[PDB]
Amino acid sequence: MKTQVAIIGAGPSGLLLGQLLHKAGIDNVILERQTPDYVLGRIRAGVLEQGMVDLLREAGVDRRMARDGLVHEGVEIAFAGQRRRIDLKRLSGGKTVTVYGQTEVTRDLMEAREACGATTVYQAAEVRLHDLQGERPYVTFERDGERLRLDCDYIAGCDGFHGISRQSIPAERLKVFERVYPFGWLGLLADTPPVSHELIYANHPRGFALCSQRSATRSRYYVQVPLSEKVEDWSDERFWTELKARLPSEVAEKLVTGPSLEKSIAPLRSFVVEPMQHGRLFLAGDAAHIVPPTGAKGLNLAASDVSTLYRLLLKAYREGRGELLERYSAICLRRIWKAERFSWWMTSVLHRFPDTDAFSQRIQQTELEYYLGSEAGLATIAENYVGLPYEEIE
Amino acid sequence: MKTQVAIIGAGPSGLLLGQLLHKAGIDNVILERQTPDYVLGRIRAGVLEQGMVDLLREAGVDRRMARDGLVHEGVEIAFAGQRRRIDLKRLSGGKTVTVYGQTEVTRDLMEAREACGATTVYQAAEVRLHDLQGERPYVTFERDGERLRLDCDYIAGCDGFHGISRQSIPAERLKVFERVYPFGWLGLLADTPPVSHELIYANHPRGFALCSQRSATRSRYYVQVPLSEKVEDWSDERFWTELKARLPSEVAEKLVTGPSLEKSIAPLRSFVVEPMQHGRLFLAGDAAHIVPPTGAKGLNLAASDVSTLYRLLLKAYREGRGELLERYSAICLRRIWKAERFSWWMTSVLHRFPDTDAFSQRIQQTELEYYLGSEAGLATIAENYVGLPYEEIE
Ligand SMILES: Cc1cc2nc3c(=O)[nH]c(=O)nc-3n(C[C@H](O)[C@H](O)[C@H](O)COP(=O)(O)OP(=O)(O)OC[C@H]3O[C@@H](n4cnc5c(N)ncnc54)[C@H](O)[C@@H]3O)c2cc1C
Numbered sequence: 001m002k003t004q005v006a007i008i009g010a011g012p013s014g015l016l017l018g019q020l021l022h023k024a025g026i027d028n029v030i031l032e033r034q035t036p037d038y039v040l041g042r043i044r045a046g047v048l049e050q051g052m053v054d055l056l057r058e059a060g061v062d063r064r065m066a067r068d069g070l071v072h073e074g075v076e077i078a079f080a081g082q083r084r085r086i087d088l089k090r091l092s093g094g095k096t097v098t099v100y101g102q103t104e105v106t107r108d109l110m111e112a113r114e115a116c117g118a119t120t121v122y123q124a125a126e127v128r129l130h131d132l133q134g135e136r137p138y139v140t141f142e143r144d145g146e147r148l149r150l151d152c153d154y155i156a157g158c159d160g161f162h163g164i165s166r167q168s169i170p171a172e173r174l175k176v177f178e179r180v181y182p183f184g185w186l187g188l189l190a191d192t193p194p195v196s197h198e199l200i201y202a203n204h205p206r207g208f209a210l211c212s213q214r215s216a217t218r219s220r221y222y223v224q225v226p227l228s229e230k231v232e233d234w235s236d237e238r239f240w241t242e243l244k245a246r247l248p249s250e251v252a253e254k255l256v257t258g259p260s261l262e263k264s265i266a267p268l269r270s271f272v273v274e275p276m277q278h279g280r281l282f283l284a285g286d287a288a289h290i291v292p293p294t295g296a297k298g299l300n301l302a303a304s305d306v307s308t309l310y311r312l313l314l315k316a317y318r319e320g321r322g323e324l325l326e327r328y329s330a331i332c333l334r335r336i337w338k339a340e341r342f343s344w345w346m347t348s349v350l351h352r353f354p355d356t357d358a359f360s361q362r363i364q365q366t367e368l369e370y371y372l373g374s375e376a377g378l379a380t381i382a383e384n385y386v387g388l389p390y391e392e393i394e
Numbered sequence: 395m396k397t398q399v400a401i402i403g404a405g406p407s408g409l410l411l412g413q414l415l416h417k418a419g420i421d422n423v424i425l426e427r428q429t430p431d432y433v434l435g436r437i438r439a440g441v442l443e444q445g446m447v448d449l450l451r452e453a454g455v456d457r458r459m460a461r462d463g464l465v466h467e468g469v470e471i472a473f474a475g476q477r478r479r480i481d482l483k484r485l486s487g488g489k490t491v492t493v494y495g496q497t498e499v500t501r502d503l504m505e506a507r508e509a510c511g512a513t514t515v516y517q518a519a520e521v522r523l524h525d526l527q528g529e530r531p532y533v534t535f536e537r538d539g540e541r542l543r544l545d546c547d548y549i550a551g552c553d554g555f556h557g558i559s560r561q562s563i564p565a566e567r568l569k570v571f572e573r574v575y576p577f578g579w580l581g582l583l584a585d586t587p588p589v590s591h592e593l594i595y596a597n598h599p600r601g602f603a604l605c606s607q608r609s610a611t612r613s614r615y616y617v618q619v620p621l622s623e624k625v626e627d628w629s630d631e632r633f634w635t636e637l638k639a640r641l642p643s644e645v646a647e648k649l650v651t652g653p654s655l656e657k658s659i660a661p662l663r664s665f666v667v668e669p670m671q672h673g674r675l676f677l678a679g680d681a682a683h684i685v686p687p688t689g690a691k692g693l694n695l696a697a698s699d700v701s702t703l704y705r706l707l708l709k710a711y712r713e714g715r716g717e718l719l720e721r722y723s724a725i726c727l728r729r730i731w732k733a734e735r736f737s738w739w740m741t742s743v744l745h746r747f748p749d750t751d752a753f754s755q756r757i758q759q760t761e762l763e764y765y766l767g768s769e770a771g772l773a774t775i776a777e778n779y780v781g782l783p784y785e786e787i788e
Pocket residue numbers: 008009010011012013014031032033034039044045046102124127158159160161162163164187266284285286287293296297298299300302
């Protein structure tokens with residue numbers, strides 16, 4: 001079996017890269033461990049930066065998003081009784097963010113890939129990577145007991161945090177940066193009207209709470225929860241009572257609750273590897289870095305990594321400028337570190353940490369008061385929230 | 395002995411409050427433990443916000459400052475080889491800061507107080523405060539062996555961090571917030587031309603360094619130093635070699651060194667007490683809060699506390715609105731907490747901390763890169779650096 005670009009993983013990263021490449025005439029094959037049904041069962045993210053919205057349009061997979069996605073011009077932050085709205089549009093110079101679920105984006109891409117007939121192998125077991133520094137790297141995998149080999153020019157590791165691609169680079173070539181937080185988020189998807197037209201991040205003494213949405217009739221809520229909690233200890237009833245306790249009264253009063261469609265606990269973490277490539281292997285998305293979901297940068301960093309990789313592969317194939325691929329990491333990392341700093345900052349001011357002394361609590365409260373009450377403070381949040389500009393390469 | 399306002403301490407706070415009050419017709423007596431010579435030997439701070447510059451003018455003690463002080467429109471931050479200038483004037487909407495030493499301000503006030511004949515008792519030993527909640531509080535002290543009593547209406551505790559006034563409030567009425575940093579600043583005063591027309595804060599891998607000044611022929615430099623260091627372990631020669639090692643080469647190359655006039659180590663700390671008053675006693679300056687010197691807010695918070703206390707005492711005496719004095723703490727604390735947050739922030743991004751893991755070092759470097767390269771980021775530093783607006787009271 002032979003292709004130009006082998007893509008490990010059929011999540012947002014792999015599918016988006018694959019569609020962009022296909023549309024440009026660059027053959028690519030995607031290998032996925034799971035079934036399409038399993039991939040479609042993941043709920044996850046719901047906020048898209050303008051940059052990712054444009055990338056989807058460029059990949060020609062935006063009809064459903066332009067119809068069902070909700071454009072948001074502001075977000076609210078609630079702390080100490082008050083609610084402060086950050087006008088993203090005004091403060092960022094006119095940029096907005098789009099709420100359209102990660103599940104929906106994935107379904108749209110899977111649908112577009114099937115229609116075009118590009119190759120996708122689901123249930124590709126025991127995927128292994130070889131000859132990464134050769135002129136001809138290859139991938140071996142198993143489809144129903146028999147071991148097959150796939151030859152290619154390049155390999156894009158879009159296999160997420162637990163993927164095989166990052167594990168295939170000699171550990172000595174990689175520098176890891178990581179921070180584990182002492183809490184996770186318990187999320188709940190409900191077929192109920194959202195409590196607000198815009199998102200609400202809430203810093204409350206009992207912990208963080210977030211009111212989000214997927215459409216006019218589907219809501220998504222999250223509450224900060226200790227690492228020790230098991231999802232089976234949280235009945236729907238317990239969740240609503242707790243969400244309500246963390247929100248301002250005028251918001252909790254008008255909350256329409258209902259049974260959960262999905263409920264899960266995701267732990268918070270920061271992780272970056274440098275470089276993000278080795279020979280003919282390039283990491284993209286969760287395979288290369290993780291951010292706590294507080295700034296909604298996860299799916300968005302995957303998109304920029306992909307936008308950068310795709311434009312560099314295009315130069316390599318169409319223009320014969322294969323040497324530009326050496327710049328991938330440098331380019332991606334500048335954006336990744338700023339998104340990591342923003343996500344770290346949002347996380348530290350909105351959540352309640354266990355070992356907190358009095359001085360730090362007061363500093364946390366003051367950060368909010370300063371950033372939310374100063375025009376310059378609001379602009380730092382806003383420009384970071386809509387997404388800093390993608391670099392153009394060279 | 396009888397007066398209207400008893401003032402404990404003849405540092406910047408007490409003298410400024412005393413001059414303002416005297417000029418308005420409100421009698422006040424200042425009690426100081428040390429001699430005038432001892433007070434004048436302290437070097438300390440050198441940066442004044444516009445607010446403090448206006449307060450000095452209002453107190454009529456600005457002739458020398460208007461002549462010898464240097465107005466600065468920007469400051470530089472050096473990190474990772476580069477130097478970035480923050481245009482304070484442009485970014486703050488036209489505000490600047492004035493470099494005029496704390497020693498000079500103190501000398502100017504002491505001179506003005508002597509000329510007007512207001513009462514100042516130096517070497518007032520064993521000062522004690524009594525009947526703080528009565529209608530008539532009083533102060534007792536010792537002048538050459540004999541114990542004297544001073545009756546008054548109000549007492550202003552302007553006695554610094556180790557003063558007796560904060561110690562005189564029942565510990566149970568006070569809430570303390572404090573953070574001790576694992577380093578101090580080794581400062582050096584030299585009769586040499588400063589290396590730059592503007593200040594330079596430097597984040598270097600060996601530690602923080604700061605290039606400041608007092609005039610066109612007098613310089614002040616500081617280097618971050620461990621808590622374990624003794625000043626006698628730092629010869630002038632050792633200091634210059636170390637300063638030079640922490641600065642960018644084009645700056646170190648042109649540094650004019652020379653023997654020290656003064657050299658001392660000051661440890662870094664944050665401290666706030668709430669409330670800042672008890673009965674007829676009001677705390678002002680270092681007696682109520684401490685900030686690390688990184689943001690130069692120490693002497694500046696003393697000035698705002700004083701400006702607030704003076705305007706409230708004026709209302710009380712001239713207008714009979716004695717009830718407004720209950721608002722002192724609330725008003726002062728809003729400004730103190732924002733200055734504390736700023737000083738904490740400056741401190742954490744410019745200094746090298748001992749227990750730092752890789753992720754944090756990268757986050758520290760990114761904070762600098764973001765704040766120094768974004769117009770909104772630069773504006774947060776600038777507005778905070780020139781000094782947030784004084785509240786007008788009511
Ligand atoms: C559990 C979890 C919860 C999240 N929750 C949120 C959230 O609530 N909000 C938010 O803002 N962000 C959240 N995120 C982040 C956001 O969803 C991710 O950044 C985004 O999914 C990244 O996309 P990706 O394509 O890089 O990886 P993924 O979506 O993880 O997809 C990678 C794919 O590779 C496949 N794969 C793995 N190993 C192999 C292999 N060995 N061979 C072949 N295929 C393989 C996997 O099956 C998977 O399909 C969450 C992420 C995770 C892991």
